[PDB]
Amino acid sequence: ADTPSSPSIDQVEPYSSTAQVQFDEPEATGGVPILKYKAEWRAVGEEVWHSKWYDAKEASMEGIVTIVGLKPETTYAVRLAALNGKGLGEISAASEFKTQPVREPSAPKLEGQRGEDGNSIKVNLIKQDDGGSPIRHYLVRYRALSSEWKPEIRLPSGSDHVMLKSLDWNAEYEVYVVAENQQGKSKAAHFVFRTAAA
Amino acid sequence: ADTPSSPSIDQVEPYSSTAQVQFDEPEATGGVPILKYKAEWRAVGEEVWHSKWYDAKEASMEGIVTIVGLKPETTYAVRLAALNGKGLGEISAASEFKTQPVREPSAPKLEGQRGEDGNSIKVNLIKQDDGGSPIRHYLVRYRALSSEWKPEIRLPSGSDHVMLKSLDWNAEYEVYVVAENQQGKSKAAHFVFRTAA
C-alpha cells in the first residue's frame, strides 16, 4: 500500500565510461514487491538528471547495476529509487564519483596451438584490460627471424585467434600482436615458434 | 521458423571479479522476438559452465552484459546464446580472457563545504577506483595544526561525507582520509582549513 523506502548505496566503482553501483534493497518495500530500480546520475554542473530503469530481479541477482555512456574524467552524482506496484519510492542520498581517464590498451596474452600442418601455427588470443575504451583492432606482424616482415594483418576486436598458414619448413618465426583503441596502441606481445622439418 | 543464430562477442573488458561483455545480436528469425541472452563462463581448466540470463531489451539499451562472481587473476572462457519463443539458439564460440589482480584502492578526492555553523565543515567525498574490490572503510583523521591527531573515525563505504563539528573558532585544521579494502589502505587525501571567527 506504500511506496518503497530508499535503496542504500554501498559501492560505486567508477571506470572510464561506465560505473558499477552496488546497493542494498530498501528496508521497507511498501507492501508490494519491488519491480524496478530507477538510476539517476548527473554530471557535476548539469541541472537535469539522466535516468534508466533496471529490472529488480536481475539487479538483485547481480548485486549491481551498471550505468553506461559516461564521459571519462568527469565528476558525477548518482542516486537510486525503488518502484513497486504502488509507485516510486524515496531516492537515496546522492553518491559522488569521478570517472577514470581512457588509457591505451594493455597487451593481450598469447597462446600457441597446432595448426592443420607442420608449416602453420594457430595463435589464440586471451583478452586483457582495454584501457577504458573499446578495442578497435589487433595488429599482427610476423616474420622468419633475420628476414623481412610479411604484410601486417588487421583483426577485428572480436577475433579470438589468428592463423599463420603456408609458412616455410624448418624455419623460426616471431609474431607480434598489438591491441589498439581510439586512444592508441598497446605494448606488443611477442611469441616465437618453429615449424616442423617436413 | 526456428531459433536464432549465435550472438557475436566484439569485446570483453575484464576487471577483478566482473567482466563487461559487448556483442552483436543475431537476426530475429522465426517471426518472433529475442527474449533473453544466455551468458556462459568457465574458468579455463574446469568442466562445469556457470550461467546467467540477461533481459534482451535491457541488454540492447545497455550495450553490454556484465558477468559477476569471478575470481581475480583467472583465465575464463565466455560464450553467448540468444533465447526466443521457439527456443534457445546456438552458443557462440568461446572468447577467452583474464581477470585483473586486486589492487589497493585509489585515494578519494576531498571537497570542502560549509557546515551547520562557522566552527564546523562538511567534507564531501568524491569516490574513485576501489582497486577492483569493495571498500571496507573510509579512515578519517583530523586535528588542529600543531597538536595531536584526534581519534580515528571509521566511515562505512556508503558514506558520502564527513562532518566535523564543535571545533574551536578561528582555528586551523587538516583532514586525512584513507580508503581501504581487503587488499590494503590507499595513500591519504588531505584537506586543510580554518574555522570562522
Author numbering:
A (entry chain A): 497 to 694
B (entry chain B): 497 to 693
The authors write:
The neural cell adhesion molecule (NCAM) is the prototype and founding member of the immunoglobulin (Ig) superfamily cell adhesion molecules (CAMs). NCAM is present on the cell surface of neurons, astrocytes and oligodendrocytes, where it mediates homophilic and heterophilic cell adhesion. NCAM is involved in neuronal migration, axon growth and guidance, as well as in synaptic plasticity associated with learning and memory. We conclude that the NCAM–FGFR1 interaction at the cell surface may be transient or stabilised by avidity effects resulting from receptor clustering and that conformational changes within NCAM may have a profound role in FGFR1 activation.
When examined by size-exclusion chromatography, all three mutants eluted as a mixture of monomers and dimers, similar to the wild-type protein (data not shown). We obtained crystals of the M610R mutant and determined its structure at 2.7-Å resolution by molecular replacement. The relative orientation of the two FN3 domains in the M610R mutant is less severely bent than in the wild-type structure but still far from fully extended (interdomain angle ∼ 120°). There is no domain interface to speak of in the mutant (240 Å2 buried), and the conformation appears to be stabilised entirely by the crystal lattice. The conformation of multidomain proteins often is influenced by the crystal lattice. The neuroglian tandem, which has an extensive domain interface that incorporates a bound sodium ion, adopts a conformation that is intermediate between the two conformations we report for the NCAM tandem.
